A paper describes a structure:
Adeno-associated viruses (AAVs) are small non-enveloped viruses with a size of approximately 25 nm. They belong to the dependoparvovirus genus of the parvoviridae family and carry a 4.7-kb single-stranded DNA (ssDNA) genome. In this study, we present a novel capsid, AAVv128, which was generated through rational design and exhibits significant differences from its parental capsid, AAV8, despite a high sequence similarity of 99%. Here, we present a novel AAV capsid (AAVv128), which exhibits significantly enhanced transduction efficiency for photoreceptors and retinal pigment epithelial (RPE) cells, along with a broader distribution across the layers of retinal tissues in different animal models (mice, rabbits, and NHPs) following intraocular injection.
To characterize the structural properties of AAVv128, the purified AAVv128-eGFP vector was subjected to cryo-EM analysis. A total of 90,744 particle images were obtained, which allowed the generation of a cryo-EM map at 2.1 Å resolution. A comparison of the AAVv128 structure with that of AAV8 revealed a distinctive structural feature that may contribute to differences in capsid thermal stability and transduction ability. The AAVv128 and AAV8 structures were similar, except for the 3-fold protrusions (Root-mean-square deviation (RMSD) of 0.507 Å after superimposition of 516 Cα atoms; Fig. 6b, c). The 3-fold protrusions were more pronounced in AAVv128 due to the 5-amino acid insertion, which protruded radially outward from the capsid surface, forming a larger loop that had greater spatial flexibility. The 3-fold region, including the protrusions, contained receptor binding, infectivity and antigenicity controlling residues. In AAV8, only a few hydrogen bonds were formed between amino acid sequences in this loop, such as the interaction between the hydroxyl group of T591 and the backbone carbonyl of the symmetry-related Q588 (3.3 Å). In contrast, AAVv128 formed a large number of hydrogen bonds between amino acid sequences in this loop, including interactions between R588 to R596, Q593 to A595, among others. Within the amino acid sequence of AAVv128, R588 formed a strong interaction with R596, which appeared to stabilize this loop, acting as a zipper for the “pocket” loop. Furthermore, the amino acid sequence of AAVv128 loop was more positively charged, resulting in a 0.83 higher isoelectric point for the entire AAVv128, with a pI of 7.69 (compared to a pI of 6.86 for AAV8). L586 in AAVv128 interacted with R596, whereas L586 in AAV8 did not form such an interaction with the surrounding amino acids. These observations suggested that the transduction efficiency of AAVv128 at the animal level was substantially better than that of AAV8, potentially due to the charged nature and stability of this loop.
Residue numbers in the entry:
A (entry chain 1), B (entry chain g), C (entry chain H): 218 to 743
The structure:
Amino acid sequence: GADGVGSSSGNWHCDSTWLGDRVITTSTRTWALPTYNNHLYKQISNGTSGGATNDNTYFGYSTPWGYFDFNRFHCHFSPRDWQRLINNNWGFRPKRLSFKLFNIQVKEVTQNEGTKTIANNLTSTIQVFTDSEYQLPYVLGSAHQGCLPPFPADVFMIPQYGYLTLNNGSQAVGRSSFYCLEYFPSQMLRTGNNFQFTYTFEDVPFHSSYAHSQSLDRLMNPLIDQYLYYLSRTQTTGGTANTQTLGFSQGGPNTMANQAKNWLPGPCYRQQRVSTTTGQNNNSNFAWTAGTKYHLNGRNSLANPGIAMATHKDDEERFFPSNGILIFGKQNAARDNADYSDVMLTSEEEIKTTNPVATEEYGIVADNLQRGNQQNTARQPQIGTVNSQGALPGMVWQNRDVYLQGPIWAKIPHTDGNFHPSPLMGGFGLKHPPPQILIKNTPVPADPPTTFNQSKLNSFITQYSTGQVSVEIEWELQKENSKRWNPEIQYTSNYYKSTSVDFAVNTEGVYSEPRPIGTRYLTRNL
Amino acid sequence: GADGVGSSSGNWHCDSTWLGDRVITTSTRTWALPTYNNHLYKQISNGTSGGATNDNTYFGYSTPWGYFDFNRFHCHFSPRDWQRLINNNWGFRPKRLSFKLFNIQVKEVTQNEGTKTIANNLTSTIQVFTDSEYQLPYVLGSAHQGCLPPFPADVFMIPQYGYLTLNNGSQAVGRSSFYCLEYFPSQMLRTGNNFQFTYTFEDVPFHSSYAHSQSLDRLMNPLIDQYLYYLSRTQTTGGTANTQTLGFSQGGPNTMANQAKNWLPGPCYRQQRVSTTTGQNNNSNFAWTAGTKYHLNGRNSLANPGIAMATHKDDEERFFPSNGILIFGKQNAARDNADYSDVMLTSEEEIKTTNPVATEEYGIVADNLQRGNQQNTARQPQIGTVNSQGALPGMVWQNRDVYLQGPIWAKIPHTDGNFHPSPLMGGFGLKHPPPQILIKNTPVPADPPTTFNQSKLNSFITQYSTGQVSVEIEWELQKENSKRWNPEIQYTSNYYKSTSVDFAVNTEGVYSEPRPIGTRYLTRNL
Amino acid sequence: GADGVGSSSGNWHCDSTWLGDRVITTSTRTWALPTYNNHLYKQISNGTSGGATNDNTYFGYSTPWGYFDFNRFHCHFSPRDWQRLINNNWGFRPKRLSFKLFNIQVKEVTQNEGTKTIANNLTSTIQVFTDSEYQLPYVLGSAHQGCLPPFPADVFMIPQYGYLTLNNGSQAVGRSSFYCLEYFPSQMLRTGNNFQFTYTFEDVPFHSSYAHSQSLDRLMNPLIDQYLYYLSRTQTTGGTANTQTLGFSQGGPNTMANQAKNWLPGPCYRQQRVSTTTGQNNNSNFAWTAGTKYHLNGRNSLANPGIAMATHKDDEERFFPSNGILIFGKQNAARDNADYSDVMLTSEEEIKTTNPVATEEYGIVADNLQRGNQQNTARQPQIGTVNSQGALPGMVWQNRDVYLQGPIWAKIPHTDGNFHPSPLMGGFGLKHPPPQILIKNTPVPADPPTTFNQSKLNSFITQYSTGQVSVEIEWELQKENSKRWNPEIQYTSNYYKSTSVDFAVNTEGVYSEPRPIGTRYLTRNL
């Protein structure tokens, strides 16, 4: 058509459409983009000279660009839409997305004395491009702030793009890369232009939006015996001097721990157990010294949250792995040293059926070769505790649950090999994820001098931009086909009276999410 | 055409053609083939009676055949061609090969008194066949001598084919197989015939001809905080009597070791650390007693080189895993007890970014369940060191690098299951690799007696054969598409003056390779 | 389409595409254009009255226009792209270019009291035209500041156009020309218009992007003697009284300086030798008194850098010709009297093979006619040193190398004759080079008086302009086809750790180039 100062370049479109095995969520927000870094790229680093430990060293670059992040589930689903999803579906996955950037408004700020004036700059541009070839460091999938807000009426600030590369302390090495984002083709938009692009998700397995109604060690028939035998006795009984013997029995309903089985629980990487009753915990600061870590290039990193393991066993909801769960913060919680009442701990107890408990061992194996007292001195069988266990043939396991406040996807690192590349924070591991959209205000110089100077211009017009952003994702559903007789467990609001509605604004206009909501409510058989 | 004594049956073809995403290397050499084993098959074995340990016992057969081996990279690539490959390509893999055997010359040796005469035997044959059905023990892929020489002007001797089967000490068992290679269809060639065959590689992943410019624990945005919380404090501070508490923080730029992450480093099988400064090593002979071994049927075998792990961490190039690297020998180095200055140690430091260091642990896991002093005696959290770690979900890793002097492929054992079947010595794991070409001089009996005798003939005419062999491999390239601004690291010759040119002959005509050359020079993002 | 205030008239396009024998570099920058000279043309001159010497006199005109200059190699090539070029190609040359000027923003500045306000002037224009007929003095190709910056994120100021004509001291002569650039057809652009033009380079020889692996005096076979003889002796030996004789020998492997040869080294114009170790230089200020100069119309001009000669011989990297090399300045170096550590000296040592050393003589010639003592007094042969040598038949030579920071082209003067018209600063000599693009802000008068006045208006509205400029050049490549066995020399980054990445921004956002990069890394035979 005809795009100009006086015409609108897009419409507000926030909705959700359920149709068959599909649900299409569309979302629109209003953003603001400042000028970052004074239009400069800056080398950033952190060494041990300052006072940091070797574990927190880095070397990277801070860019003047910003980026869009809709990598949380509440960016697309309302709390009621999340309820329709998790109460009626066994699984879901993303199919394709559309992204739009419209109604651009570039404004200039003047500051004579103590007066601040904001006026339109009708001829200024913003630059937008997507990293469709995955040529920049991918910083989505690290659970960073700056998402599209969950409440459609909130206006958000676009976060600043930065990246890291190889370091040796605060220094760089020969393989450290430097990226200029102006070295990419970018689209320039004045107040009358808009931007848009579409993306198609690759085939990714459905998320397991269910709990198991059987456990792995209870797949048997509780009425029939097994025809296989197991060693049930190595020493006679009854008499006064018991001797060695061999005795075998058939596993039945009363001895189900001895029965022969076909499968094994998933892998284990044991965590430390912490109680929410502080009086039960040890009186020391063991959050880091006793943490569950991995070692990479002489640098210790917390395995957080780590592989998917059950949070606790039966009747022990007060225990959690020290760094083995996702922890969200309540509305307006401190950044550092928030109290327990200010955060919301998740719980993966739904996978007790196949996954080992995060704070327990995997099992028991033998240590030595037992013998009698025939020739050499008698030796008693020794056993060892398996606290870490990699993949064994015949293992089955579930992934970590996704949450309304949690991440959606992550980029699978480009490596030679990987094992079960599902992100450890939960979500869909993608070889080619949604590309990151980079955005920036084109610099506008102030009046240059009237005599030539070779130096680069460092005096600019103060500016920022505003506009709307809409993202539409189509999800595929996996409906449940269950013959269970009794009613299921569902997610529900509390009927009782209260001061405020959950998932609503309070008297000051602050929207908040009172609890985290997983997706495992319906049940399945193993 | 017309093949006979006076016409040539092939041309010398040693070259390399780069065209697009393909490179075609052709190579020709001159070989000599003796008579092996006096035309006999011989049972060979080694037991503990002789003085060998149980780890080195074997039972097998020594055959009179020889075999062709072009399973090193310098058989096909010149040092300059290797430089064109590793400086410009992110990956490569083999596609198809052609093999030719031509200009056969069978010669007979007579030895009257102290006189030695060598004359043509125009009517003698050689036998050639390829094990296209993989019915013989495959001895390629064990890094054996007898390759086509790297320098095209060198004449090489064809190695003798032998194989092993099951043993119990120096003895055999009922499942031990005996193979006669004369029980195969074979092609007989006189001085005017030639042999040829073609082969097509199966789909194999490209070799990672790059290093990572990011590390796994540094995929985050260094400017933005995380919205997820982690347990940062379990004990109050400041006061005189500190009590238990729970405190949570958000991971940010300054605490990147505590941030939530999606992935884990690759598996670990810890090695012993040895320094090239001998004064730093322990004063004992621990090369075998402290080696990193695996146990199979009561036999210990060194895990050499083992799974792909980083050789050392930053600033520690003097350390290597005791048996975790490929070690090549310099030109004319001893077979036994060569000094350190006579060998060339490789280094896989390029995979510090995803793979754990070979001489370090994998990480830390919990040992016990910590508790306070509410009821039972207080217990402090205990941690354990993970020195071996199998595959965990969310692991990523790189393979071992390939070298100019290193092997190309290996045959994947025919088993029920395998995990990431990439050869541990580096290269391409193939279910059906290039078949082994077997070659032999047909026996020519001396004058038999004039009265019949049933005994097999054990008097033959002394003979050997000569000819040329050409092998042409087509490789597929994977070009780099990088937006890195600063220059890359490249492999380069030293500009400074020297007594000899590297990768050239010296004054005596001896060709040598001064250093090993890997393939990871360009960089990528994770 | 529809061009106006609210629509963008161009997109940011900074990229490089390698495809076969072509590489296409595109580059976009943001510029600022002030009002120059108060919209006036001004006669400028410099005589000896002021204090200048006769060598620095001039007469010319300063115009109110500005011009665009992309005549350096870093305007188009990133440091990594320069590495892809010089490591893999024997030669390159430019083919065609595209130029675009878009997103024009004309702004007006008001200055009431101590307050400065910058507002859009939507109805103001800029004027742009290209000198496609080469009718103005061509000031590109004089290595002037004001290029498009090497770092795409830098905003640059457009330089002011001026020119010189004939002078006699500070005065002009009858042949001195005066040019008004308003006497050209020019395109006027408001904030919604854009400008563009294309250009095709003429056929120019490829740049020699290689070094020679042979030298001119070593093209012989080192094993065979020559059949030609040379005079090897003019006096008998051995006896007590030696007499005159004639003795001839054949040139062989041991006397290669006496062998007959077909060619001669290139021309010479000897320079003065300066050491970078200051203690080795003479203790006097000889930079100008001992400089290597040419004389034109009673005016001395430094021959800088002069004809292409080798910088130094073997093992003498510390010596350079006093004014015979290109010298670039490090980031933020002084304009006058910069120390040696603030500049980067180039070195043309790669042409030792065909070109004479800049600080050495060309050779030796005879001075007199030698004779004996038969009649007149005996005379000994005299020799003279050739310090300058023009073109001789059978000469071969290389041009000067091009650098990443160096110039690309120059305009060949329109004369009756020229010898080897390749610019002495390095690059491509073009009869019709890329035309210079002239740009200016159209003057906007302030309020004129209400009574008529014939005087020209000298009160204007303060103004400047901003916009983007994109230039795309297509280069043709000349791939190397070498049979060299050993690896080549390549340009590479240093692997060692460092405080900053080379060719990247520092902590303050300042981009810098640490060293000059030539193009002669691969090798050829003579």
